[PDB]
Ligand binder design. Sequence first.
Ligand SMILES: N[C@@H](CC(=O)O)C(=O)O
Ligand SMILES: N[C@@H](CC(=O)O)C(=O)O
Ligand SMILES: N[C@@H](CC(=O)O)C(=O)O
Ligand code: NA
Ligand code: NA
Ligand code: NA
Ligand code: NA
Lengths: 61, 411, 411, 71
Amino acid sequence: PGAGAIMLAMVLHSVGLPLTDPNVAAAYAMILGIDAILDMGATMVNVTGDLTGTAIVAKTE
Amino acid sequence: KYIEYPVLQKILIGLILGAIVGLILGHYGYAHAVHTYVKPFGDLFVRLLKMLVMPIVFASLVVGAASISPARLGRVGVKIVVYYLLTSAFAVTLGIIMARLFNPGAGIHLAVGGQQFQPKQAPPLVHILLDIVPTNPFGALANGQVLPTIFFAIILGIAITYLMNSENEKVRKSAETLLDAINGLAEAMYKIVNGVMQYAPIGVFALIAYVMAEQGVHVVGELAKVTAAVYVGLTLQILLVYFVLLKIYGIDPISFIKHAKDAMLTAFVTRSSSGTLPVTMRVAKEMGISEGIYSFTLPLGATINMDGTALYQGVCTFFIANALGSHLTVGQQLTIVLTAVLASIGTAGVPGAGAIMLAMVLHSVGLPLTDPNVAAAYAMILGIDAILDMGATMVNVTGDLTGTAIVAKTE
Amino acid sequence: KYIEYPVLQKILIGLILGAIVGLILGHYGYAHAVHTYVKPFGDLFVRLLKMLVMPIVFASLVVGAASISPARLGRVGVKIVVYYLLTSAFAVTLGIIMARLFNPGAGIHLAVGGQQFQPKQAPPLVHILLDIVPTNPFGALANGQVLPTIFFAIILGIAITYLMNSENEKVRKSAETLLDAINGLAEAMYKIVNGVMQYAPIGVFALIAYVMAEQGVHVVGELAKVTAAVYVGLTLQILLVYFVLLKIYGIDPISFIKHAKDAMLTAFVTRSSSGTLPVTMRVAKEMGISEGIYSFTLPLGATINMDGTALYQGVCTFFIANALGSHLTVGQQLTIVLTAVLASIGTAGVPGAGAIMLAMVLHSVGLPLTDPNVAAAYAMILGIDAILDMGATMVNVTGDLTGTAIVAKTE
Amino acid sequence: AYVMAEQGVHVVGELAKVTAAVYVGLTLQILLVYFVLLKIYGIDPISFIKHAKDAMLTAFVTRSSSGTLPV
Ligand SMILES: N[C@@H](CC(=O)O)C(=O)O
Ligand SMILES: N[C@@H](CC(=O)O)C(=O)O
Ligand SMILES: N[C@@H](CC(=O)O)C(=O)O
Ligand code: NA
Ligand code: NA
Ligand code: NA
Ligand code: NA
C-alpha cells in the first residue's frame, strides 16, 4: 500500500520540479493526504489488468 | 577606495540594489548561483558581528553593573520585563487583528479532522531558571551562552563595586586595575563594531541578495496574503505602539529612528538578534543611554522580546487554520496570544527559529503537525519564511531599544 | 643538580646520545619497551611547550598589532605571503631535483595501470577563509584554534591603538590597563618558555630515543634512498635558499643559526611547528625582531609555510611513481609542485600530518590510493615517516624565522 | 575476463615470482600427490581428469568451492 505515492517522487524528479522546494513538498503533502483513497481504485485496476493480461494470453495459447 | 561614502547611504544603497539583483536573479532561476557566489560575503558580515558579541556583552555588563546601584538594576529589570511582556502580548493581538482584516489561508480549501492530541505541553521552567546561573563562567563565555554570561557580569560588577568601599586600599587598587581593563575591552569592541559596519554595505547587499533570490518567488497568492498582513502589521507596531510609547515617555520618536538605522538595518538583513547585538548596543551608547541599563536590557531583549516573531506567529497560526477552514474563535484566539508570547520568548535569536517555534503555537490550538494538510500549509509558510524573518527581526530589535530608552528615561 | 651546565650543550648532548640509545635499543628489538619507558619524558616536554602556545600567541599579537601601524601589518603581511609561497614552491622543485638526482623507488619493480579517477578535487577555499573569522574568540582560544585567534588579536591590537587616540582620557586609562596586563601575560610566557627548555635536554633525548627506536631499522634499501634524497634535499634548501636570501638581505647567515638552535632543535625533535612556536617566537624576540612582526609571521607560517613538508611531498610522490614505473615527466612534474605546495600549506602543524597529506598529492597525478601496489609503496613511506618528519619540521620552522628576519629588515 | 583485467598487470618482478612459485607448486601437487595416489589406489589418473574438467574449470574460474559444488 501507497509505495506508489512514494514512487510518485521519481516521476516528479524526472521533470523540472525538485522535492526540496516547500511548495513542491507542500502540494505533495496534500496528495499524501488523499493517498490510500487513490490507492484503492489504483490497486483494483493493477490486478484487473493482470487478469485480463492472463485470460487474453491463454485464449491465445 | 570609496574613499568613504557615508554608511547609511551605502548600506541603504546595497539593500535596495541587491534586493533587485536578488529578485531578478531569483525569479530567473539562479538562486543557487546566488547562494554560491554572493552569499559568503553576506556571511562574512554576520561572522564579524558575532565575533564581538561575547566580549562586548560581558565587558560592558561588568562595568555597567559596577557603575549602577544593585537597587536600580533590580528596578530597571522588573521594569523591562513587565514592559517586554506587555509589548510581546500586544504584537500577537495586533497580528490576529491583521489576519482577521486580511485573510491569508482562507481561499485555500483544505480541511482535516483530528486532534488535540492529547496534548502534552509544559515548558520545564525550573530547569530554564537554574540554567541562567552558569557553573563555569569561563565555560559559558567559551561557547555562546549569553544569558548565563549576563548573570555573571551582573554578579561581578556588583562585587567589584563593593571592593572599592573596603577598608584596605590595596584591594581597591586591584579592583580598579580589573574594572579598568574590562572597560578597556568593552570600549575596544565598540571600536570594532564600527570596523565591521564599513563592511555592512557589502554584507547588506549580499544578504537580501540571497534572501530575496531564494524566497521572493514564493510570495504569491494566499502566501503573498500572509506577507502583507504580517508586514503591514509589523509596521503598524512600530507606529501604533513604539512611537506612541516614545512620544508618551517624551523621547523623540523620529529622532529615535534618527539614532539609526544601523541596528534597525543589521536586524533586518541578518535576521539574527544575537548577531545584531553589537550594533544594537553601539546604538544604545551612541544615543546616550546608560551602560548599566543598556548592557542588560539589550542582551536580555535580544532573546526574551521578539515582538515581530509573536506577530507572525499570530498571523501564521491563522493561515494554517484558515487553509483547513478550522475557525478558531473565542477561546483559541485568546490561547494564541498566550502561547505565541510564550513561543517567541521563547524563540531563539537566530534565523527562522521563530518559524520552528510556530509549531508550539499550532499544537496549542486544535491542529497537530502530523496531518498532511496541516503540514502541507506549514510547508508553504516555510517557503515565505526568510522573507517574513527580516521584518520580524527588525522589530524584535526596535522594541528592545525603545524598551531600553523608555526605561532609562525613568531612572 | 647539573648544577646548570649550558642548554645547547645538554640538548645537543641528549640528541646525539638518545639517537644512539634509540637505534641500539630499536634495532635490538625493544622499541615497544622505549615507547613505554622513555616516551612519557619526550612527551612531558611537548606538553609544557604546548601549554604556552595559546596565551603567548594571543597576548603577543595584541601588543604587536597595537605597537605598529595598521598600514605596516598590511605591508609586512603581503610580503611574508608572497615570500612564503615562493619558498614553498622552490622546495618541491628542490625535492623533484633530488629524486631525479638520487633514484628512490626505481629499482623496485611493481607496476599498476588504472586512473585517475575521475578525480574529484577543489579545496573549499570559501569556507577556510570565512573560518579565519571566529565567532567566539573566547571559544577559539579555549580550544586550540590558532588562525582564528590571530585574526582577533590583530583586530584587538588595532582597536586599542585607536582608543589611546580618543578624546576622553578615561578610556585611554582603561586602554592601557588592558594592553599592559595583556603584555603582562605575553612577557610572562616568554619567561616560562625558558622554564621548560631547561627540561628540553631530557625531552629531546627521550623524543629521538623513541622515533629512532621505532623507525630507524626501516631506513634500508630503497627507503634509505628516499631518506638520503629528502635529507640531502633539506640541508640544501638551508644552504642554497636561506643563507643566500639572508646574505642578500644583509643579515648574517651564520649569526642566524647562531640565534639558535633552540627553535631549530625543538622543530626537529617534536616534529611539531605548533609545539615549537613558543621557542620559535622567543628566538624572534631574543634576536631583536620587533613584536609587531614576529608574533604575526611565526604563528601564520607555523601552519602556512611548510618548506620541509612540501619537499618530502615531492620526493615521496616520486618514490611511489618509480616503484610502479609510472613515469611522470612534463605536465605532472609541474603539477606536483602546485599540489605539494597546496598540500603543505595545507598540512597541519603536528606530527606526520604531512605524510597523511601525501595522499592528496598522489591523486593529483595518475595513481589512486586504492590500488595494492600504490598502497604497498605508501605503506613503506609511513615506516620511514617520522624520520623524514624530523628534518621536514626543522626546515618548516627555519623557513619562518628567515621569512620573518628578512621581511623585518625591510620594515 | 575481469580477474585477468584487474590483476594480470600486477604479475611482475618479485610478484610474478610468487606466481611462478605457487603455480608450478600447484601443478606439482596434481602430478606428485594425486596422479600418484590415483595410480596407487588403482584408479586411472588420466581417465580421472578425463571425468572433467567441468568441476576443474568452474573451480578455477569462480574461485568458489562452494559455488562449484553442484558441478
Ligand atoms: N531570526 C529571528 C527569530 C524569528 O523570528 O524567526 C530573530 O533574530 O529575532
Ligand atoms: N611534523 C611536521 C609536519 C610534517 O611534515 O609531517 C611539522 O610540524 O611541520
Ligand atoms: N577461492 C578459494 C579460496 C582461496 O584459496 O582463497 C576457494 O574457493 O577454494
Ligand atoms: Na529581540
Ligand atoms: Na526568543
Ligand atoms: Na611552519
Ligand atoms: Na600546513
